[PDB]
Design a protein around this ligand. Structure first.
Ligand SMILES: OCC1=C[C@H](N[C@H]2C[C@H](CO)[C@@H](O)[C@H](O)[C@H]2O)[C@H](O)[C@@H](O)[C@@H]1O
Length: 512
């Protein structure tokens, strides 16, 4: 298991390859596997670099195994949407079985896993929950059990679930869905919550690391204590360097705001990656300037909704294990979390849940799809859930699904993009509070987007443009990717919902 990230292993050669844009994707060289000791490669590089007619591209090809060019998968013709999804899971399944070089950035895992697709050649944390939803729908429980085993292994090995199983992802996590993954598995293997309680508790300790030493108004890593003593979590990456997989992007973003310390920009870029919303006006002081991103001074409402669910599931796992003391402890933590959400992440002037600003010490005004998360995890009061439903129908519901924000910044977690996980969180949260009409509106409009895109493009994609139906989304630092893990998973769950359980549909119906 290579723990040293490529930027450190390969020093100036890494900076050279990335700054030269040898490859159109910065992630490509981050995933390049050295054919020999980096000490040798750097020595050979230092000596061969001076030679006239030295070709950096040839040196890289000589000394590195590069990621597969992605010679496109071709399915049999004529498959329906459901057929296409059902038969695509093997295409997205990968293992670390390959003869593992000591310096491979891909971290070994015990079991096979499902990747999102395209350039995403590793297992991702929050993607996998929504992928598991689709695997469960289509009766692939061994694949689900295997991925839960992988995530438990990562918790035991690294202390937390990394963004993905890459050395350059070890410094951060992602939206914490592991407890909800175990809950999903428990619907099939009734002992799963008891079985994985130790890793669930270890992950909780990672998020809460240092909470006991905090005074009001202080923060440590992923946890904050507000001026009134309320305890909440934030996204946080342990490093303050450029992301190796986006090296040149982050260097240039830092150079675009030279009056700000680059380490602070890098920390907030990395922590936005930890949020899953890389990137969004949600984190930015100026939605047109990524150099104004300030993720670590924002208390995210979605993260703290997920922390509430984790505390509730830890109490359930403890209660099922016959551990009354732990069950009581975690129930009390969940109760305090719910109060902290209602007291600090509710915008009463606007009538929706929102992030909390650590600088101004106030709930923020911006409406994003994260406002649905307290409904999703059943922390919201009914009257506030009703107001969020009204804000959703009136501001976020678009022809092709629920919008991510109302700000078209050019970043990908923003208008006009709709993301499968947010469609599911919205539909479920609305359903949890009896808002069945808006819930079905989100479901139907996103399914129509997925079906029309599949009819026209013969694929599912990473995100969708919700201003119409039939087109994938865009924005941000890399092109729209195909596959695609959570799009496929959410689509299966929603497709089952719009046709009778006894006569399922394989395409989204024409009407309703
Ligand atoms: O589908 C995988 C992911 C890719 C996207 N982010 C990845 C790509 C970024 C490089 O372009 C990487 O820095 C980030 O950590 C990764 O999680 C997306 O925004 C995430 O929500 C998602 O989990």
């Amino acid at each position: 298991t290579q723990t040293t990230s490529p930027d450190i292993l390969l020093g100036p050669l890494f900076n050279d390859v990335q700054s030269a844009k040898l490859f159109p994707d910065q992630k490509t060289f981050a995933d390049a596997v050295p054919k020999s000791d980096p000490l040798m490669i750097l020595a050979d590089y230092r000596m061969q670099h001076t030679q006239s007619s030295f070709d950096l591209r040839h040196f890289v090809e000589m000394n590195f195994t590069l990621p597969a060019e992605g010679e496109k998968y071709v399915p049999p013709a004529g498959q329906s949407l459901r057929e296409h999804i059902d038969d695509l899971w093997p295409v997205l399944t990968r293992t670390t079985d390959k003869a593992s070089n000591k310096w491979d950035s891909l971290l070994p895992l015990p079991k096979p896993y499902v990747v999102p697709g395209g350039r995403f050649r590793e297992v991702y944390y929050w993607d996998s929950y929504f992928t598991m939803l689709g695997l469960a729908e289509s009766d692939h429980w061994d694949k689900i059990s295997d991925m839960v085993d992988n995530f438990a292994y990562e918790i035991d090995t690294f202390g937390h679930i990394p963004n993905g199983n890459r050395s350059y992802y070890l410094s951060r996590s992602q939206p914490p869905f592991f407890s909800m993954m175990v809950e999903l598995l428990a619907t099939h293997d009734s002992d799963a919550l008891k079985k994985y309680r130790p890793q669930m508790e270890k992950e909780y300790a990672y998020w809460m690391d240092g909470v006991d030493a905090l005074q009001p108004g202080q923060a440590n890593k992923r946890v904050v204590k507000l001026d009134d003593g309320a305890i909440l979590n934030r996204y946080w990456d342990d490093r303050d360097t450029p992301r190796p997989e986006s090296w040149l992007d982050d260097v240039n973003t830092a150079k675009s705001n030279p009056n700000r310390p680059a380490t602070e920009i890098y920390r907030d870029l990395r922590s936005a990656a930890a949020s899953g919303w890389d990137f969004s006006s949600r984190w930015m002081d100026d939605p047109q300037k990524l150099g104004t991103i300030r993720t670590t001074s924002i208390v995210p409402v979605d993260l703290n909704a997920l922390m509430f669910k984790m505390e509730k599931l830890l109490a359930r796992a403890s209660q099922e294990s016959g551990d009354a003391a732990s069950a009581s402890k975690y129930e009390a933590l969940a109760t305090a979390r719910q109060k902290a959400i209602e007291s600090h992440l509710w915008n009463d002037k606007e009538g929706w849940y929102a992030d909390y600003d650590l600088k101004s010490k106030k709930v923020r005004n911006q409406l994003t799809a994260a406002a649905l998360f307290p409904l999703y995890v059943k922390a919201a009061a009914q009257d506030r859930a009703d107001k969020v439903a009204a804000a959703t129908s009136s501001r976020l519901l678009k022809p092709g699904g629920i919008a991510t924000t109302t700000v078209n910044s050019g970043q990908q977690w923003d208008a006009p993009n709709g993301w499968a996980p947010l469609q599911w969180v919205a539909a479920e949260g609305l359903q949890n509070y009896g808002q069945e009409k808006v819930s079905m509106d989100v479901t139907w409009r996103f399914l129509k987007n997925v079906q029309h895109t599949y009819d026209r493009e013969k694929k599912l994609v990473e995100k969708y443009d919700v201003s119409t139906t039939g087109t994938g989304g865009g924005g941000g630092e890399y092109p729209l990717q195909d596959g695609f893990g959570w799009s496929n998973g959410v689509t299966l769950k929603m497709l089952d919902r719009v046709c009778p359980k006894a006569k399922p549909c394989d395409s989204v119906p024409e009407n309703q």
